[PDB]
């Protein structure tokens, strides 16, 4: 049998400047993106997120499609340069009434609203003081935190601080694939402390002006070994250390893997005590994104943690080319477990995969029975992480909608929704009805 | 196009006590007439009775977790009054009421709105051993029957029903013999008929007097269709409509008793006294249709006492029970009630749902039954077109929550959109059932 | 001259919680800043606080009794914030709301209507300590509050009241501090009352999302009368009448705040944001009046804030508590309340009764308080001219049922219609409890 816990929540995922358009609309600063974005060379064939899926035009008929899809939540991110221009100061009535009308929407629907305080759309304004390498940014974003705690009080009632920490930081700062797009480890070191710094400092503010539930969203990319041969479990371990600890432990009050001062040498730092017991401030449950594992060998010039992925051609691969593989995530879902102490409830806030589909509807349908395939075989491989003692609280597919994948532009679909970016049309993909019977039957369809 | 319900549209199921209840004479029980009728060889389909049923009596629990897995916002049921009030008359039984005393309270923690009904089918014995229906002193013995329940559930049951289908009962119990207490007789049944309007109206003013909310009937109807252009055809259609579906309504809307039953009735019919027609006439605050179907009569010289009889409409799907699928039929009474009573009177349709052939136990863990999904989508839709045409619709029970006793044809018909295994009382949520949650989850909208 | 009440006017008694129940931190209880005040010494008359009361936490089966003696058809009380929710915030306490989970069940068993007020001056302390009435986050504190009890007693308590008079919450809490929790400021007397309507408008929508049957707010009354045809006398009555009759009453009719507590308040007034007066301004089902006495203000200068002050009317009886005994003054104010109100909303006097020297203990079995039956029979009277003057008043409730804390001026002010002694808590029914026990058994006929 595979039907799924009592209370046990469904439901699908966004971010802000992957779906909005409309990024200077109605008051609305201007983010890291907006500059990132408009520079040559940054995105796949210049791609920006100016229109995306005109979500702040069409969230309505989105809201009707969530409905179509059985849908009990939608997890969405709150672009802070629409709320608050300048990062600081003044707040934009017209951006915050967006997500006031998109709040009672959802409520009105049934759907519980699952908002992310920071998903990688950081205020220019805020870059031009440094951005993630300002430490005061730990405040600032603390008070963008409460402007939406006490906005939404009552109404949202399960807060994300931070969307994947790596992803900022790795793609942000150390590689800079990502807005703001800097190179450097000393900048990606520090940018990682204040990230987790500025969690502490929201969940802080969250216990004095919120009510509610709040935690952080972390990424897990589970490294598995390649051989037997040392070099190679030594490489293992800086890449599991640099991408699965670096933020994990000292949010578990751990510290920092003592194998990242390998990883960054010189770029290392020692941090006060008091940051720790600010990043370590206690939270009421966590989000794991998850997509695939990796293999991890020894690679004396990889940059900086010295290693890199084994191709795994036994399996399926993505259209972002990662390996498709069910069973790691029940590992990854076991291991976070045992990391947390069983103690802090969990649910996963993002899965999903990207294959290709056509720009457009074949007659009113979207065939992609590999995303199909990935939905079910992961979903089971939860049921499987339920079944080990897991407290696992719900599940929300990436994404709801085709959208802009970042810095690889539209060219790489994750909805369950189709959307053909020349007319904003939306069609549900097999996927998406098919999730909609796992949603209805609570599971047991897998049977 | 939309088919999203109108606000605090209500939606549910119902069942009746005889059918499901089981334990009739348990517990203090009285004996009524279907315990007799029961119990009488001949009468009953295999000898089917209600002695067990869907033991609802003892597992009324399990059925309240299934009303909230339907997601039913209304429960419509019956009491029974032997349960209540053994002899009909005179001392309760504690022990009868503390039970629909314990199931209210269920329903009402469970969020789910009580329906209740006060007569369905099952007269005290000790009541038909003193004429039953035929007497005129019945109209006083169900207005004090009404009165202990008006009283014993003030504030917790809001929406009263006083008879259900006077016709299944007359025409049934008194005309045909087909239901308890099993009479043959047109001169009983134009007595039974008035006797039950009657008390009718006086279990209206003794809700005036002492009751709180809202009373109405329960009326079903099977609107008659035109067979052909014969004038015949049309005289024995409109003989038909007068004796089904008019007999009732009409005194109910003070137009007195349609002349044809003059023609259909002969040397049975009678003229009442002109006040017995102000008591029937008592204003209600809402009105229950049930409906399944349509016939289309034609003349039949032998065929007693409204010389007509169906035209099999070989175009349709019909159910177990023999009766055309044919959902624009339900739109078009909706109206015609509406028009009946002037507009001004709430309506709700109280039964409506459909019988097909169910395996005796579950085929892993579910009953497959599309004809019945299909009867659902095409008769909800039907009522969004009712409404659309300004019907004051205010809600909908299907019939029924469980497989019961579809009474004389034993447990043969299941009308339920829960499956019941009587080998073993286990419940199986049909898919009809499954489809039905949606519909109100969705507020109709799943039917776009 | 008849006195016959209208069918189904609801005759009753009222009480506080902190002023009956003592065991005020018992059974997981939290402090409320009624414990905190009466333990601070200067605060209460003879140093009385409310630790025992008439100890009805412990007592109250014997009350109930003492409420069907005298044949009460309701029962209006409140409930204590902090022993249902010890911190004000978070965690509920089961013993607490189980108290009046029993109280509630035994009334209805009783076929005594429970009457609920969610506050009656007994904040908990640990919501002071975060500014209690001047922090703007108590309208959602309350509501929860409010859900809890709307939620535990959903159908058994039908008739709800959300604040007991802000006036003396505000006036004696915050702008003399009088009352607890003894502050004394123009600036926090405007903020604080803001807050209090405020929280009565979240109360209702809470109510109106999870609750069932009426909610309303309670208001006390003090009708302002001419001191003399001097136009600064006028200008007097108009300020006190404004800063004590109108002040809530305005704003929860939509009327905005009264001009004259520009006046009044000076530099201490504010302007308060739009949409508040949109909550505030939440249509309520009912409307209770406490009513006492009536007052005649003069012009003094040196009177703050009001720069006003009553004029001693030596023609008439005064209670204990020095309030004139003048019974056309509650016909006037009950017109007046209807007029203010339109007519629509329904009325019910939740407050009315009068305090005279009792001995501490019975006199062979009795309790002689002719005072306190003739102040009894002539407002009732009162209450039956206002009626006939077309105010809809639906009930009425003497306060208080027992002799008990007079808050600030403790025990030596006895209210009851049931004599307490203090020093044994032996209950004695006074001979207004007698003679209020034949107005309600004889609906009003006992004063023809
Ligand atoms: O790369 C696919 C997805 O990865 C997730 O971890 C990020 O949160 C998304 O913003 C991104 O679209
Ligand atoms: O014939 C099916 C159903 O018909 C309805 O009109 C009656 O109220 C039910 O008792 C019966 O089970
Ligand atoms: O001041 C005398 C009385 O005033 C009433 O309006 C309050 O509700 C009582 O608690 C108090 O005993």
């Given at each position: 049998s595979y039907r799924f816990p009592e209370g046990f929540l469904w439901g699908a995922a966004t971010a802000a400047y992957q779906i909005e358009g409309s990024s200077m609309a109605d008051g609305a600063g201007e983010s890291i993106w907006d500059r990132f974005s408009h520079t040559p060379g940054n995105m796949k064939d210049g791609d920006t997120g100016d229109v995306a899926c005109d979500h702040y035009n069409r969230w309505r008929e989105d809201i009707?499609?969530?409905?179509?899809?059985?849908?009990?939540?939608?997890?969405?991110?709150?672009?802070?340069?629409?709320?608050?221009?300048?990062?600081?100061?003044?707040?934009?009535?017209?951006?915050?009434?967006?997500?006031?009308?998109?709040?009672?929407?959802?409520?009105?629907?049934?759907?519980?609203?699952?908002?992310?305080?920071?998903?990688?759309?950081?205020?220019?304004?805020?870059?031009?003081?440094?951005?993630?390498?300002?430490?005061?940014?730990?405040?600032?974003?603390?008070?963008?935190?409460?402007?939406?705690?006490?906005?939404?009080?009552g109404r949202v009632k399960t807060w994300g601080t931070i969307n994947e920490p790596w992803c900022i930081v790795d793609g942000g700062y150390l590689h800079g694939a990502l807005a703001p797009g800097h190179r450097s480890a000393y900048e990606a070191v520090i940018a990682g402390h204040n990230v987790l710094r500025a969690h502490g400092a929201?969940?802080?503010?969250?216990?004095?002006?919120?009510?509610?539930?709040?935690?952080?969203?972390?990424?897990?990319?589970?490294?598995?070994?390649?051989?037997?041969?040392?070099?190679?479990?030594?490489?293992?371990?800086?890449?599991?250390?640099?991408?699965?600890?670096?933020?994990?432990?000292?949010?578990?009050?751990?510290?920092?893997?003592?194998?990242?001062?390998?990883?960054?040498?010189?770029?290392?730092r020692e941090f006060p005590k008091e940051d720790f017991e600010l990043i370590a401030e206690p939270t009421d449950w966590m989000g794991l994104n998850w997509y695939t594992r990796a293999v991890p060998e020894n690679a004396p010039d990889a940059w900086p943690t010295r290693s890199r992925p084994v191709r795994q051609t036994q399996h399926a691969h993505t259209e972002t080319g990662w390996e498709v593989?069910?069973?790691?995530?029940?590992?990854?879902?076991?291991?976070?477990?045992?990391?947390?102490?069983?103690?802090?409830?969990?649910?996963?806030?993002?899965?999903?995969?990207?294959?290709?589909?056509?720009?457009?509807?074949?007659?009113?349908?979207?065939?992609?029975?590999?995303?199909?395939?990935?939905?079910?075989?992961?979903?089971?491989?939860?049921?499987?992480?339920?079944?080990?003692?897991?407290?696992?609280?719900?599940?929300?597919?990436w994404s709801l909608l085709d959208n802009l994948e970042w810095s690889l532009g539209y060219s790489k679909r994750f909805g369950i929704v189709h959307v053909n970016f020349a007319t904003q049309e939306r069609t549900i993909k097999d996927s998406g009805l098919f999730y909609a019977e796992v949603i209805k039957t609570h599971g047991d369809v897998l049977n």
């Open positions: 009707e499609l969530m409905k179509r899809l059985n849908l009990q939540a939608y997890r969405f991110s709150v672009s802070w340069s629409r709320v608050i221009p300048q990062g600081r100061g003044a707040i934009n009535p017209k951006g915050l009434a967006f997500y006031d009308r998109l709040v009672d929407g959802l409520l009105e629907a049934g759907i519980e609203p699952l908002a992310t305080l920071y998903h990688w759309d950081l205020p220019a304004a805020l870059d031009d003081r440094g951005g993630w390498l300002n430490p005061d940014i730990a405040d600032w974003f603390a008070d963008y935190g409460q402007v939406l705690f006490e906005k939404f009080k929201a969940v802080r503010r969250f216990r004095e002006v919120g009510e509610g539930q709040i935690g952080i969203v972390l990424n897990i990319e589970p490294k598995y070994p390649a051989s037997d041969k040392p070099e190679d479990e030594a490489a293992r371990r800086r890449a599991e250390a640099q991408m699965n600890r670096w933020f994990l432990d000292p949010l578990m009050g751990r510290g920092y893997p003592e194998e990242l001062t390998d990883v960054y040498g010189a770029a290392w593989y069910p069973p790691a995530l029940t590992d990854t879902l076991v291991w976070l477990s045992e990391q947390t102490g069983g103690k802090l409830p969990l649910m996963v806030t993002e899965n999903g995969s990207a294959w290709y589909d056509p720009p457009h509807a074949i007659d009113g349908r979207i065939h992609d029975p590999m995303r199909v395939h990935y939905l079910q075989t992961h979903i089971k491989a939860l049921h499987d992480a339920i079944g080990k003692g897991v407290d696992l609280r719900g599940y929300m597919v």
